[PDB]
Amino acid sequence: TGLLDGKRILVSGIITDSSIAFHIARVAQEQGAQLVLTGFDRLRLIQRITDRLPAKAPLLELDVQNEEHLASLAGRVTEAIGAGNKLDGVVHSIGFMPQTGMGINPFFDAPYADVSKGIHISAYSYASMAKALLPIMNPGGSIVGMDFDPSRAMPAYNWMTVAKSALESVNRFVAREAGKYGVRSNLVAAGPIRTLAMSAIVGGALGEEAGAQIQLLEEGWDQRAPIGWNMKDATPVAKTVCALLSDWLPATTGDIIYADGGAHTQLL
Amino acid sequence: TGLLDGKRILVSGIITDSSIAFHIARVAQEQGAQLVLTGFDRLRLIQRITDRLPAKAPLLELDVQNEEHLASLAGRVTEAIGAGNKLDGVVHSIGFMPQTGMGINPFFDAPYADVSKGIHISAYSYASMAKALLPIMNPGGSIVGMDFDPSRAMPAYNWMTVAKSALESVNRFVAREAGKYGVRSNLVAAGPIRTLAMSAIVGGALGEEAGAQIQLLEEGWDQRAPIGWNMKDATPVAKTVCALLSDWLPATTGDIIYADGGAHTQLL
Amino acid sequence: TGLLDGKRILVSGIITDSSIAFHIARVAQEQGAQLVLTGFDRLRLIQRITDRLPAKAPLLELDVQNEEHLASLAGRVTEAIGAGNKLDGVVHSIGFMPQTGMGINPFFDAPYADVSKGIHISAYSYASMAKALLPIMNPGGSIVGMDFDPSRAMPAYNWMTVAKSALESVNRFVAREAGKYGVRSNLVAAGPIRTLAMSAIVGGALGEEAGAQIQLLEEGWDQRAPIGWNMKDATPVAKTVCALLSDWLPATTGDIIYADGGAHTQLL
Amino acid sequence: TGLLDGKRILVSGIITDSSIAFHIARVAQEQGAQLVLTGFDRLRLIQRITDRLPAKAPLLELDVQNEEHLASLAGRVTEAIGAGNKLDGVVHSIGFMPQTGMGINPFFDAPYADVSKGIHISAYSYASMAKALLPIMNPGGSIVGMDFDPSRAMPAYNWMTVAKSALESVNRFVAREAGKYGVRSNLVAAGPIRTLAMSAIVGGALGEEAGAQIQLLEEGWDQRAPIGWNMKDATPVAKTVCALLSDWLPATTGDIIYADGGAHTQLL
Ligand SMILES: NC(=O)c1ccc[n+]([C@@H]2O[C@H](COP(=O)([O-])OP(=O)(O)OC[C@H]3O[C@@H](n4cnc5c(N)ncnc54)[C@H](O)[C@@H]3O)[C@@H](O)[C@H]2O)c1
Ligand SMILES: NC(=O)c1ccc[n+]([C@@H]2O[C@H](COP(=O)([O-])OP(=O)(O)OC[C@H]3O[C@@H](n4cnc5c(N)ncnc54)[C@H](O)[C@@H]3O)[C@@H](O)[C@H]2O)c1
Ligand SMILES: NC(=O)c1ccc[n+]([C@@H]2O[C@H](COP(=O)([O-])OP(=O)(O)OC[C@H]3O[C@@H](n4cnc5c(N)ncnc54)[C@H](O)[C@@H]3O)[C@@H](O)[C@H]2O)c1
Ligand SMILES: NC(=O)c1ccc[n+]([C@@H]2O[C@H](COP(=O)([O-])OP(=O)(O)OC[C@H]3O[C@@H](n4cnc5c(N)ncnc54)[C@H](O)[C@@H]3O)[C@@H](O)[C@H]2O)c1
Ligand SMILES: Cc1csc([C@](C)(O)c2nnc(Nc3ccn(Cc4c(F)cccc4F)n3)s2)n1
Ligand SMILES: Cc1csc([C@](C)(O)c2nnc(Nc3ccn(Cc4c(F)cccc4F)n3)s2)n1
Ligand SMILES: Cc1csc([C@](C)(O)c2nnc(Nc3ccn(Cc4c(F)cccc4F)n3)s2)n1
Ligand SMILES: Cc1csc([C@](C)(O)c2nnc(Nc3ccn(Cc4c(F)cccc4F)n3)s2)n1
Ligand code: NA
Ligand code: NA
């Protein structure tokens, strides 16, 4: 029997097979979950990518900044899962911060229009997806979002760290609302993962200094982590999301679970 | 001798004599500081209010959402303090969250345009003011912002709590930039204060439930505070800001000082 | 298939069928784990209680304050599980604070001899058990301890809260040592549970005031928990421990998982 | 006028002129405080050291593990300050952890007798001095203890980090008790300071590895600190204690003020 047997789970955030959501989606399918997938912009590309998952799943378009996509979401999910059925899980694996607010651009040089777009996609949309999906979720259900520990400041992350701090606060309010439906809301704070944006910065796309800074963060993370940290392996992160989606953490809500090799609990 | 003798300090946030900034400005002046004041919108009203302070101080217009006011700020401050002079301190006592994002309106019913405006004024502007003023600040200088503990969710505060969570993260990045100038950046987390907006909610402006919830927050705050908490007295908060503006906390930066009667350290 | 199929798990802390450890042991067994149980003092009583579990399990004597019991632990466990076999998990569900240090006695009136005994059993023993068992634990293994959120002070808990603060720090160092063996170390922060000591205080054993204070803590806990909190149900806590014992949280170490209905994330 | 003008302050923890308490005592005297000093064991040595302070002050013997020294403390202080007078400040700058629980000895190899002595001196004694001195403290008074951030584990510190975690919890309970007297209780979390024990470990007294670990911690601290960190300068730490002893932080209790150059707010 699978960890997610009989559970209907919506998974957002798939762009490539390197996406954390792809690995969440693959592990949930191996664990017997029935998926509904959401994608943004490059729908032709994600269709080809989602065809690489172990099982077939409906693919729905969802731009979190689009009010019409959100207003129709619940109805579109119902048509995909069939009338009389509700979701048991929701995975928010969405984030974006323009290069003006994250990378090499000075912290003070990020224009608010760009910071605002980043906070809309990365923090406010966790509340927006919860508003749209809670009326179609079963009691005992679970909403999971992806977090990057923003308790301490660090180089390059800049406005993304601010957006993550806003997301942590949003998660605590979403828990109050979701609790009325018997639904839990939690964040998984993952260690750094070699996704396309991460591979670009380490590889030198943002220059020598930025690459050296992220390489130092990765090296230090693995050193600090009592059990080590492998940036090239999204599996432990995907497994943690599936633990939260299961019925095995039923008294955890408005919380953060750290899937970071324990690096945040160690100074040196 | 005064705690702030010979120091040039910019104080933003004065609207009425109930404003936390008014009490900070009054305590700073009693302590021998030379002030520069900034005000938004009702300049005629704030001129009459600033005439009630113990000493005369220049009043400059500053709308934090206005890029032209920001771009000219340093130049306008220099003309008020005199050429060759720099500020030893900056007080950010600015906050705003539309009623759609704070109050009786459900957490999910706040439109992003309103949330975005609130975060711009309440969080991003701490960075925007630091960007404008750091080139005109002396080493040993101090930037102080006002916060309301957002570590745990609570009724009615809603998107303001999300804005305060974003501000705490902003302060940690401001500290990195300000450190290059030998300047400290900190937040003062005050307990609830009976300012105009607070007096309105307790008084019943937002209805029976909202008034009851805020009364319960206040009552509980005073109960958990080992030294109690007087919501009608802004002096202990003003004194704490002045301590951070002084040379008496010289190794504290990117941090939060709680002027809350110790309420946050107690469960019951 | 069970969540804990094929895993050998040591479970300490059983005294009655109300013990949190009893519910952890019962859930682990339903999930296909092979248990080794440890008990203190009343072995005849605990044998009768352990006979009430779904499956038979060896019972070993372990007084954590007894260096001879500690020195022989690994050898005695090996004889119970069979030569060539190792443990996949350890559950530390042990705690004690004399009434001078927890209850109605003023915080200042607890003698150090009593405080010291409480910290030995409640905090130091987590490290002492990890020292004794790590040489007989498999890579991928898990050590779990029971905690009660000590981040904020509260009435009556007194020196137990100080012991829990020490335990949280111990867990972070245990993680460093356990990481060398590929073993994770975590704490489960449970909400209040109606165990024998808890039922006594609520029931009036320590007088009118102490009973009223604990009733107020319980009532408030259920109020702040977005998903509520049932003090008479240890199952959600037992399930959370089993999640940490499983392979489903493999990148979490030196950490705390809150099985508290989300109460700690909410102010009111 | 001085920051501590007219204030009677008890300062414990002077052993050499490198002691953090020596610098607290020197700064408080420059700020016009009237001191009462306490010393342990080497009274002849501390007399010669205390003679190097800017002003004369009574020296009282105080071993925190000695019940008779604590029972007579208040009476002995009254005789030194004169009948009819009370203290306005108390500085706890005491700490000890045997080499078995801090340094090169493995974390698991510290015997409880040694850990217990370390917790008695470093954590329990903060409560013991508060019990003895609160009946002779004025309203508006302040108790300050020295802390080393124990939120994250680190090499060598070992059981001292555990004792500091216990101290942080003790401080929160002492605040509840002190609040009944109108007295605040806070901790100052200092960055690393080149005291005799610190100079010995960096210098190589505990071997090559331990020296390299502490040198790395110091180097990293200064790097992480937005305003830098000078381990050879206790003045910023002494100034922070004097800020807490003053009337300038009157609504802060059961709290921690970080005098660490802001290093704890930055990851890298
Ligand atoms: N090191 C890391 O990669 C790292 C670390 C911790 C947490 N996280 C978080 O995990 C999540 C997934 O990130 P990832 O690394 O897999 O990156 P990714 O690029 O693979 O996924 C991010 C996704 O956000 C989607 N998205 C962006 N704007 C959108 C919009 N307007 N509407 C809908 N979807 C939109 C993109 O299409 C993409 O699928 C993010 O929230 C990220 O911040 C990442
Ligand atoms: N209980 C409380 O009142 C409480 C508690 C903790 C922290 N705080 C924080 O303290 C600060 C001051 O609040 P207050 O209670 O004195 O309220 P206030 O209304 O007296 O002051 C808030 C100020 O923000 C200014 N402001 C708003 N929009 C602006 C803009 N675009 N440009 C520049 N200034 C603008 C207003 O003119 C006003 O002077 C805020 O950051 C608030 O969040 C308040
Ligand atoms: N509300 C609560 O009950 C609550 C809340 C959160 C966490 N916890 C923690 O959970 C754990 C289990 O508590 P419980 O509520 O099940 O109580 P319990 O009394 O049922 O179990 C505590 C156990 O500690 C054992 N113990 C005491 N001294 C010992 C010694 N010297 N050697 C070995 N074992 C010894 C006792 O025999 C008993 O089995 C403790 O660590 C407790 O602090 C309890
Ligand atoms: N890097 C550091 O040095 C560092 C960093 C942060 C915090 N602190 C803390 O600051 C405080 C002062 O430390 P320090 O560095 O000045 O060291 P220190 O050696 O100069 O002072 C420690 C003092 O504790 C006293 N003491 C020990 N046992 C005692 C007993 N039984 N009774 C009474 N007094 C006793 C000693 O006599 C000594 O005066 C300690 O609590 C320490 O942990 C130190
Ligand atoms: C927390 C995190 C790490 S990578 C990630 C997402 C969802 O892939 C991103 N969303 N928006 C991003 N924008 C930018 C702009 C520049 N980058 C590269 C970059 C990184 F990928 C990581 C750190 C710094 C950095 F500059 N990434 S990266 N989120
Ligand atoms: C942290 C805080 C408390 S009062 C405050 C400011 C600066 O006065 C505000 N800035 N924007 C505000 N917007 C609104 C909307 C509704 N209110 C009233 C209100 C309160 F004043 C306090 C709590 C809840 C609440 F609804 N306040 S109030 N900020
Ligand atoms: C954290 C916690 C809650 S109940 C618990 C244990 C393992 O049952 C205890 N271990 N030692 C205990 N000692 C005492 C002394 C007095 N009590 C009763 C009591 C409680 F059970 C709970 C809160 C306060 C209180 F006074 N409990 S209770 N530990
Ligand atoms: C927090 C801190 C740093 S130095 C300090 C005190 C009060 O001077 C100490 N109290 N007891 C101490 N015992 C030991 C045993 C060995 N040392 C040297 C040493 C250090 F001084 C610092 C880190 C590790 C280390 F091994 N120190 S050091 N407390
Ligand atoms: Na109170
Ligand atoms: Na509730």
mmCIF file with all atom_site columns, N, CA and C in Angstrom, chain A residues 13 29 39 46 50 53 66 84 90 99 103 114 122 131 140 143 153 156 159 165 173 202 207 222 230 234 244 247:
data_model
loop_
_atom_site.group_PDB
_atom_site.id
_atom_site.type_symbol
_atom_site.label_atom_id
_atom_site.label_alt_id
_atom_site.label_comp_id
_atom_site.label_asym_id
_atom_site.label_entity_id
_atom_site.label_seq_id
_atom_site.pdbx_PDB_ins_code
_atom_site.Cartn_x
_atom_site.Cartn_y
_atom_site.Cartn_z
_atom_site.occupancy
_atom_site.B_iso_or_equiv
_atom_site.pdbx_formal_charge
_atom_site.auth_seq_id
_atom_site.auth_comp_id
_atom_site.auth_asym_id
_atom_site.auth_atom_id
_atom_site.pdbx_PDB_model_num
ATOM 1  N N  . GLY A 1 13  ? 3.478   24.117 -10.041 1.00 0.00 ? 13  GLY A N  1
ATOM 2  C CA . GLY A 1 13  ? 4.914   24.382 -10.035 1.00 0.00 ? 13  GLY A CA 1
ATOM 3  C C  . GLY A 1 13  ? 5.850   23.602 -10.935 1.00 0.00 ? 13  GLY A C  1
ATOM 4  N N  . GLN A 1 29  ? 2.815   10.005 -6.920  1.00 0.00 ? 29  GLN A N  1
ATOM 5  C CA . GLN A 1 29  ? 2.264   9.000  -7.829  1.00 0.00 ? 29  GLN A CA 1
ATOM 6  C C  . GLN A 1 29  ? 2.737   7.586  -7.479  1.00 0.00 ? 29  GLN A C  1
ATOM 7  N N  . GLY A 1 39  ? -0.081  24.287 -14.467 1.00 0.00 ? 39  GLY A N  1
ATOM 8  C CA . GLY A 1 39  ? 1.077   24.873 -15.119 1.00 0.00 ? 39  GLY A CA 1
ATOM 9  C C  . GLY A 1 39  ? 0.856   26.301 -15.580 1.00 0.00 ? 39  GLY A C  1
ATOM 10 N N  . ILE A 1 46  ? 5.406   21.931 -20.598 1.00 0.00 ? 46  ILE A N  1
ATOM 11 C CA . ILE A 1 46  ? 5.048   21.151 -19.397 1.00 0.00 ? 46  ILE A CA 1
ATOM 12 C C  . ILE A 1 46  ? 4.266   19.868 -19.760 1.00 0.00 ? 46  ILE A C  1
ATOM 13 N N  . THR A 1 50  ? 5.310   16.521 -18.181 1.00 0.00 ? 50  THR A N  1
ATOM 14 C CA . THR A 1 50  ? 4.367   15.760 -17.355 1.00 0.00 ? 50  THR A CA 1
ATOM 15 C C  . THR A 1 50  ? 4.120   14.360 -17.913 1.00 0.00 ? 50  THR A C  1
ATOM 16 N N  . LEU A 1 53  ? 6.108   11.571 -16.156 1.00 0.00 ? 53  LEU A N  1
ATOM 17 C CA . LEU A 1 53  ? 5.725   11.115 -14.809 1.00 0.00 ? 53  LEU A CA 1
ATOM 18 C C  . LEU A 1 53  ? 5.259   9.648  -14.859 1.00 0.00 ? 53  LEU A C  1
ATOM 19 N N  . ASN A 1 66  ? -3.487  35.850 -12.470 1.00 0.00 ? 66  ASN A N  1
ATOM 20 C CA . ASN A 1 66  ? -4.688  35.986 -13.294 1.00 0.00 ? 66  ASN A CA 1
ATOM 21 C C  . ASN A 1 66  ? -5.953  35.697 -12.501 1.00 0.00 ? 66  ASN A C  1
ATOM 22 N N  . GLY A 1 84  ? -18.716 15.290 -7.487  1.00 0.00 ? 84  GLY A N  1
ATOM 23 C CA . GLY A 1 84  ? -18.884 14.485 -6.280  1.00 0.00 ? 84  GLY A CA 1
ATOM 24 C C  . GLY A 1 84  ? -17.583 14.169 -5.570  1.00 0.00 ? 84  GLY A C  1
ATOM 25 N N  . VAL A 1 90  ? -3.088  19.826 -1.645  1.00 0.00 ? 90  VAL A N  1
ATOM 26 C CA . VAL A 1 90  ? -2.740  20.951 -2.537  1.00 0.00 ? 90  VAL A CA 1
ATOM 27 C C  . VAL A 1 90  ? -1.265  21.222 -2.309  1.00 0.00 ? 90  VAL A C  1
ATOM 28 N N  . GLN A 1 99  ? 15.178  39.571 -11.627 1.00 0.00 ? 99  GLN A N  1
ATOM 29 C CA . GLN A 1 99  ? 16.633  39.714 -11.420 1.00 0.00 ? 99  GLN A CA 1
ATOM 30 C C  . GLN A 1 99  ? 16.998  41.052 -10.734 1.00 0.00 ? 99  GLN A C  1
ATOM 31 N N  . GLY A 1 103 ? 19.789  38.290 -7.009  1.00 0.00 ? 103 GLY A N  1
ATOM 32 C CA . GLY A 1 103 ? 20.980  38.075 -7.801  1.00 0.00 ? 103 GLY A CA 1
ATOM 33 C C  . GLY A 1 103 ? 22.100  39.038 -7.486  1.00 0.00 ? 103 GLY A C  1
ATOM 34 N N  . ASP A 1 114 ? 8.758   45.509 -9.400  1.00 0.00 ? 114 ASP A N  1
ATOM 35 C CA . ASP A 1 114 ? 9.382   44.186 -9.528  1.00 0.00 ? 114 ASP A CA 1
ATOM 36 C C  . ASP A 1 114 ? 9.264   43.413 -8.213  1.00 0.00 ? 114 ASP A C  1
ATOM 37 N N  . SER A 1 122 ? 5.173   34.759 -5.212  1.00 0.00 ? 122 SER A N  1
ATOM 38 C CA . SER A 1 122 ? 5.813   33.920 -4.192  1.00 0.00 ? 122 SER A CA 1
ATOM 39 C C  . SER A 1 122 ? 5.121   33.812 -2.817  1.00 0.00 ? 122 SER A C  1
ATOM 40 N N  . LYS A 1 131 ? -7.768  30.145 -0.992  1.00 0.00 ? 131 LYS A N  1
ATOM 41 C CA . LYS A 1 131 ? -9.124  30.714 -1.155  1.00 0.00 ? 131 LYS A CA 1
ATOM 42 C C  . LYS A 1 131 ? -9.911  29.968 -2.262  1.00 0.00 ? 131 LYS A C  1
ATOM 43 N N  . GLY A 1 140 ? -9.481  16.736 6.824   1.00 0.00 ? 140 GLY A N  1
ATOM 44 C CA . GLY A 1 140 ? -8.290  15.902 6.953   1.00 0.00 ? 140 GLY A CA 1
ATOM 45 C C  . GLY A 1 140 ? -7.273  16.235 5.894   1.00 0.00 ? 140 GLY A C  1
ATOM 46 N N  . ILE A 1 143 ? -2.551  21.440 2.782   1.00 0.00 ? 143 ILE A N  1
ATOM 47 C CA . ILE A 1 143 ? -2.001  22.406 1.833   1.00 0.00 ? 143 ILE A CA 1
ATOM 48 C C  . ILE A 1 143 ? -0.532  22.548 2.188   1.00 0.00 ? 143 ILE A C  1
ATOM 49 N N  . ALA A 1 153 ? 19.473  37.011 7.108   1.00 0.00 ? 153 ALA A N  1
ATOM 50 C CA . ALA A 1 153 ? 19.750  37.554 5.777   1.00 0.00 ? 153 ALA A CA 1
ATOM 51 C C  . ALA A 1 153 ? 20.982  36.810 5.164   1.00 0.00 ? 153 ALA A C  1
ATOM 52 N N  . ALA A 1 156 ? 22.821  37.686 -2.306  1.00 0.00 ? 156 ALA A N  1
ATOM 53 C CA . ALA A 1 156 ? 22.025  37.457 -3.516  1.00 0.00 ? 156 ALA A CA 1
ATOM 54 C C  . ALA A 1 156 ? 20.518  37.230 -3.377  1.00 0.00 ? 156 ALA A C  1
ATOM 55 N N  . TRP A 1 159 ? 15.386  40.178 -2.177  1.00 0.00 ? 159 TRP A N  1
ATOM 56 C CA . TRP A 1 159 ? 13.940  40.304 -2.085  1.00 0.00 ? 159 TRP A CA 1
ATOM 57 C C  . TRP A 1 159 ? 13.145  38.980 -2.019  1.00 0.00 ? 159 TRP A C  1
ATOM 58 N N  . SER A 1 165 ? 9.752   35.490 3.912   1.00 0.00 ? 165 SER A N  1
ATOM 59 C CA . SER A 1 165 ? 9.351   35.951 5.252   1.00 0.00 ? 165 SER A CA 1
ATOM 60 C C  . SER A 1 165 ? 7.850   36.277 5.208   1.00 0.00 ? 165 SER A C  1
ATOM 61 N N  . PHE A 1 173 ? -1.747  32.577 8.645   1.00 0.00 ? 173 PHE A N  1
ATOM 62 C CA . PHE A 1 173 ? -3.135  33.042 8.475   1.00 0.00 ? 173 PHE A CA 1
ATOM 63 C C  . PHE A 1 173 ? -3.960  32.047 7.661   1.00 0.00 ? 173 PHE A C  1
ATOM 64 N N  . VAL A 1 202 ? 25.169  29.100 -10.098 1.00 0.00 ? 202 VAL A N  1
ATOM 65 C CA . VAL A 1 202 ? 26.427  28.380 -9.777  1.00 0.00 ? 202 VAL A CA 1
ATOM 66 C C  . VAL A 1 202 ? 27.342  28.287 -10.966 1.00 0.00 ? 202 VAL A C  1
ATOM 67 N N  . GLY A 1 207 ? 27.742  36.008 -13.350 1.00 0.00 ? 207 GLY A N  1
ATOM 68 C CA . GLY A 1 207 ? 29.122  36.431 -13.146 1.00 0.00 ? 207 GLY A CA 1
ATOM 69 C C  . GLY A 1 207 ? 29.871  35.664 -12.089 1.00 0.00 ? 207 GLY A C  1
ATOM 70 N N  . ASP A 1 222 ? 26.197  21.979 3.321   1.00 0.00 ? 222 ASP A N  1
ATOM 71 C CA . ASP A 1 222 ? 26.594  20.596 3.430   1.00 0.00 ? 222 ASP A CA 1
ATOM 72 C C  . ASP A 1 222 ? 27.462  20.374 4.650   1.00 0.00 ? 222 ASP A C  1
ATOM 73 N N  . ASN A 1 230 ? 22.740  17.188 -0.149  1.00 0.00 ? 230 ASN A N  1
ATOM 74 C CA . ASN A 1 230 ? 23.042  16.987 -1.559  1.00 0.00 ? 230 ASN A CA 1
ATOM 75 C C  . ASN A 1 230 ? 22.117  17.864 -2.405  1.00 0.00 ? 230 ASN A C  1
ATOM 76 N N  . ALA A 1 234 ? 16.550  16.105 -5.185  1.00 0.00 ? 234 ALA A N  1
ATOM 77 C CA . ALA A 1 234 ? 15.278  16.688 -4.693  1.00 0.00 ? 234 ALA A CA 1
ATOM 78 C C  . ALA A 1 234 ? 14.403  15.672 -3.959  1.00 0.00 ? 234 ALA A C  1
ATOM 79 N N  . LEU A 1 244 ? 3.808   15.424 4.780   1.00 0.00 ? 244 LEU A N  1
ATOM 80 C CA . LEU A 1 244 ? 2.815   16.436 5.158   1.00 0.00 ? 244 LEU A CA 1
ATOM 81 C C  . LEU A 1 244 ? 1.474   16.252 4.507   1.00 0.00 ? 244 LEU A C  1
ATOM 82 N N  . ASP A 1 247 ? -1.577  11.272 6.280   1.00 0.00 ? 247 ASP A N  1
ATOM 83 C CA . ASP A 1 247 ? -2.328  11.390 7.531   1.00 0.00 ? 247 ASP A CA 1
ATOM 84 C C  . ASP A 1 247 ? -1.375  11.195 8.725   1.00 0.00 ? 247 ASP A C  1
#
